[PDB]
Design an enzyme around this catalytic site. Sequence first.
Site, short mmCIF file in Angstrom:
data_model
loop_
_atom_site.label_atom_id
_atom_site.label_comp_id
_atom_site.label_asym_id
_atom_site.label_seq_id
_atom_site.Cartn_x
_atom_site.Cartn_y
_atom_site.Cartn_z
CD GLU A 1 -24.32 6.88 -20.19
OE1 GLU A 1 -25.10 7.18 -19.28
OE2 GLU A 1 -23.84 5.72 -20.57
NE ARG A 2 -19.90 12.93 -26.85
CZ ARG A 2 -19.00 13.39 -27.52
NH1 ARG A 2 -18.10 12.23 -28.25
NH2 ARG A 2 -18.50 14.54 -27.76
CE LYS B 1 -13.67 6.22 -25.11
NZ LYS B 1 -12.75 7.35 -25.28
#
Lengths: 115, 463, 74, 174, 72
Positions: free
Chosen positions: B179-180, B153
Site C-alpha cells: 500500500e502507498r 481511484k
Amino acid sequence: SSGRIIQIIGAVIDVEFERTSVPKIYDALQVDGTETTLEVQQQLGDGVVRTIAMGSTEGLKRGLTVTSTNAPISVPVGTATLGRIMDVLGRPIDEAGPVATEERLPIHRQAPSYA
Amino acid sequence: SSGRIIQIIGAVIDVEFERTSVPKIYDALQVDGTETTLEVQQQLGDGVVRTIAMGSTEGLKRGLTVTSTNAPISVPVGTATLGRIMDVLGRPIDEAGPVATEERLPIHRQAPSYAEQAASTDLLETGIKVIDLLCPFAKGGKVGLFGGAGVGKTVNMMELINNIAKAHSGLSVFAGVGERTREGNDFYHEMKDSNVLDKVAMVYGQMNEPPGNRLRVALTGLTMAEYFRDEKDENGKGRDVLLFVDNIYRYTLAGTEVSALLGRMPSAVGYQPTLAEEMGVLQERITSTKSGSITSIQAVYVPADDLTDPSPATTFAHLDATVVLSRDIASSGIYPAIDPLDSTSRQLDPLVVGQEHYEIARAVQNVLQRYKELKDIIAILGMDELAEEDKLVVYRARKIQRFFSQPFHVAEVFTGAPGKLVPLKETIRGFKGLLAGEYDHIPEQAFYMVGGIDEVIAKAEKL
Amino acid sequence: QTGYKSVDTMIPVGRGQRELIIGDRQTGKTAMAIDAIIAQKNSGIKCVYVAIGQKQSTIANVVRKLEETGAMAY
Amino acid sequence: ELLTLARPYAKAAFAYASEQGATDNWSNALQVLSAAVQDEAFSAYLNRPELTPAEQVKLFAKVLGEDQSQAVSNFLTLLADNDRLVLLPEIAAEYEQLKSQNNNNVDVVIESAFPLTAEQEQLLKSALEKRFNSTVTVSVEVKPELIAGVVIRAGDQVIDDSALNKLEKMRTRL
Amino acid sequence: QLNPSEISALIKQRIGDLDTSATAKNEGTIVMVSDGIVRIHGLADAMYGEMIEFDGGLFGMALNLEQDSVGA
Ligand SMILES: Nc1ncnc2c1ncn2[C@@H]1O[C@H](COP(=O)(O)OP(=O)(O)OP(=O)(O)O)[C@@H](O)[C@H]1O
Ligand SMILES: [Mg+2]
C-alpha cells in the site's frame, strides 16, 4: 621459502605455500625456472593462492618451484625513462640498454583525496 | 524438543529439529527470543526445515532456540474486527486496544468444492452510468482497475463502498497489499469522516516488511471475507460480502521476491514457477456459493502499460471486467474519468442482461468508435465538409460524454457529495431516447454533470 | 517550489512527496536538482545531497557552485 | 546423493580388505571413526582451519590407537585431501552391505510388541532360511506400542501382522 | 560400544584443550579473501548486520550467516 604450481588454465595459475608465509594480495613472483613473473590475485587460503601470468604460459609444469618478492610490481621512474620505450615491467625494448634510474615506484596506489 | 537457528540468508531461514519431532508445513514457529514467527515452507530432512520470518528480521542469532505451534496460522475473526486495522498477525495496529473476540480460524483452507458453486449466475448494479451500462457485474465477480493517476481511484472505491453498504447489510473489507500508505491513510480518514467503518475491516501490507507478510495479507482478507459471508443470519443465508485488493500485482511480486532463494528455479520471465498455483489458490476461493457469495475489487497496476507478459496475463484469466481508467477524459472535466471504449466485461450478454440493454450498449459502442475515427478529418477540414450525416452523430456522442459525468456521492468535497445511483432502467430510457434523438436538439452542456433525463431537461429549461 | 515554470505548473511538488526524476544522460538532472535546492534558500527547510559513483572533481565543482550561491550554509 | 558420493570409496576399501582378509579390522576402524566424527567436540577440533591434512591424519591415528594401517593412513589421507571426512559413516554402512552380500549373509530386523524368547527367534531364523538365504543376522526390537505381532524388514522387503491389518480393514470399509 | 567409544575418545585425546576453550566465540578467523569479501571461521554470535572489527582496526559488515563460515 618458495611455492609451486598446482594447476594451469590460460593465464590464471595457482601456487601452494606454507601457512608460515603466504604472499600478500599484490606481489611480484619469480618462477624459479624459466623467465616468467606472477602477480598475486586472491588469498585462496590453506596455503593456496591464485595468480595471473605476465609472460607466455609454456614450459610451465605443475610443481615447479616459485618464489615471492614480498613486493608488488615496481618499475623505473624519472627523466631517464623519457625518450625510451619500456615493457609492461619497465624493461627496455628499444635496445638502448638498461635505464639509468634506480628510482622505483609501485603500480598500485590510492585515489587522490577529495581535499 | 525445540529447534535452533542454524542458517539465515536474507529472507530464508532454516532450523534443526529432533528427527522424531518434525513440524508440518504452514504451521507457526515461535522465536523463543522475540515475538517474531516463522512459517514452514518445506522440510529438509534430518529435522531440518526452511522458513520465512513473519515480522522483523533483526535480533537474530545463529543457535537461538525456537518452538512451534504444530498448527497452521490462525487469527481472530468476527464482528469484533470491524472498523479496526490489524497487522498480518491480526494484532491491533490502530492502538485501539486489543481485539475483543477469540474466534480464531486458520488461513489455508481448500478452495470451495465443485458441487457448491452457486448454481446460477447473478448480476450487480451500481447506479453508475458507464459501469452499469458497459461494465456489468455478477455478484461474486472479479473486477480490475487499470491505470489512473490523475484522479482519486480510492474515491471511486469509497463510492462503491457507500453503494454496497447502503445497498446491503453486506459489509466490506480492504487489504493493504504494498500500500502507498499515503493513500491508505487518506482512504482511512475519508471513510472515517464518512462515518462508515462498521462494515469495513482493515489489514495492511505497506512495502516495509518481509515478502511473506505482504504475501499473506491477501490470505488474511480472504479468510475474513469467507467467515463473514458464512455467518448465516436468521434465514440460513448470510450477506454477500465485498473485497478490495490493494494490488494483485504486488501479490504476485511477493512470491516473486524470494522464490529463487527458496531454491526455486526462475520462470519464463525469471518468475516463480508456482505462479499459477498460488494464483488459482487465491482466485478459486473467491466465488459465489449455494448459500451466499463473495466478490472483490482488484486495484490493478500495469508495468509500462504492457499486458503481453505473464504477470497480467494470469490475472486476466480470472477477472470478469477490465475497467481501464482514462486520463484525458478527466482532462475533459469528467468526474468518473473512465474510458468508455476499452473497458469491457464478459457479462455483456443479452441472455443475462436482456436484449434491449445489450443492443443499446452495442449502438453506443458503434457511435462512439465511429466518432473517434472522424476526429482527424474534422480537425483537417471541419464539420461542414462532412456530409450532413454524422453531424447528429457528433452531437449525440458529445451528449453521451456529458451524460456520463456523474457527481460523486462520497467525496465530501467535490461538487457537494451528491449521490445519483440512478436505476439501470432510467438510464436505459435516457440513452434509448438519446440514440433515437429524442433530445438531439439541446446543447451537450445540459447533459453535463447530471443523471437522468429529468435532470437534463430541468437544467436545459433553467438555463 | 522549483523555479521551473513547467515544473511548478504542470507537476507540482509538496512537502513530503516521493516524486522521481528520470531521463537519459547529461540532461541537467544534476542541474535541475541543484536549482531545486537553490529555490529553498528562503523556505527555511533544510536540504541534503548524496553523490554516487562520480569523480570527486564533479562533487567539488558542485560544492563550489553552492558556496558561490552561499547555499552550502543550510 | 551422499551415499552416491561414498560409493566408490566403499568399493575400493572392500576390494582391498577382502584381498587382504583384514575386512574385520577395517570394519572396526570404520565404526571407530564414525563414532569419532559423530562427536561434535572432535569434529570442531578437527575442522579448526589451522590444520593441514597431516594434522587430521595423525589425530585420527591417535584416536584410533594401535589399530591403524598404512592402507588406513592412505585412505585417511586421500579423504582429507578432498575433505570428504564428513560422509564417512555412510561409507562404513555400504561397506557392511558389501560384506553381508559377499558372505551372502542377510541382516534382518524384527520388531515385536512383546519381548521375544530365543526359541521363537531361532524358529524365525529357520523360517527365513526356508526363504532361501545363506545366513541371517537377527536384530530384534520390543515395540509394545505396536498392538501385537512381529514386523520383519529385509531391505525393501517387509511382512506385517500388527495394527496395519486393522488400518487395511478400515480403508476397506470406507 | 557407543559410550565406550566416546570415553575412549576422551581418553586418547583428553579434552582437546576444550577445543581451544570453545575457540573464543569473540574471535573470528580470517579464512578466504577476494575482492573485499571476507570469510571468517567461527564467531557463532552474530547479528544480521553486526559491526566487525579487526586487528587492523578497520570495520566490516556482517551479512551472510552460514553453518560453518561467515560472509562479510
Ligand atoms: N536549464 C538549463 N539551461 C541551460 N543549460 C543547462 C540547463 N540544464 C542543464 N544545462 C546544461 O547541461 C549540461 C549537462 O547537464 P548535466 O551534466 O547536469 O547532466 P547530468 O544530470 O549531470 O547527467 P550525468 O549524471 O549523466 O552527468 C550542463 O553543463 C549545463 O550547463
Ligand atoms: Mg549527474
